[PDB]
């Protein structure tokens, strides 16, 4: 039948206005945020590493690192 609406997967809620998608799955414009700083990626630049999404900033902070004395 026609019993199936697109609802956020993060919190598992319905999406009426302001929504996005990720990996063939719905995501709220407030749920699709970073995994370290919880920043609304919806709109800005962002890239996932394995499963979660980490904004460039965090991405180049958690894993990335500088030299010894610097
Ligand atoms: Zn949500
Ligand atoms: Zn971040």
């Amino acid at each position: 039948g026609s019993s199936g609406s697109s609802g956020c997967v993060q919190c598992k809620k319905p999406i009426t206005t302001g929504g996005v998608t990720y990996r063939e799955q719905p995501w709220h414009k407030e749920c699709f945020v970073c995994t370290a700083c919880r920043k609304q990626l919806s709109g800005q630049r962002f890239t996932a590493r394995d499963d979660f999404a980490y904004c460039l900033n965090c991405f180049c902070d958690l894993y990335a690192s500088g030299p010894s004395s610097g």
Side-chain angles (χ1 to χ4, degrees), residues 7-15 26-32:
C8 166
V9 292
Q10 189 61 297
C11 58
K12 314 299 292 174
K13 270 44 155 274
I15 315 172
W27 284 88
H28 276 142
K29 211 175 272 206
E30 308 209 55
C31 290
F32 202 47

Side-chain angles (χ1 to χ4, degrees), residues 36-51:
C37 67
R38 309 287 284 289
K39 269 190 71 179
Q40 306 182 286
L41 312 170
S42 310
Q44 66 179 246
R45 288 209 81 66
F46 88 90
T47 165
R49 177 84 201 199
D50 299 298
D51 280 40

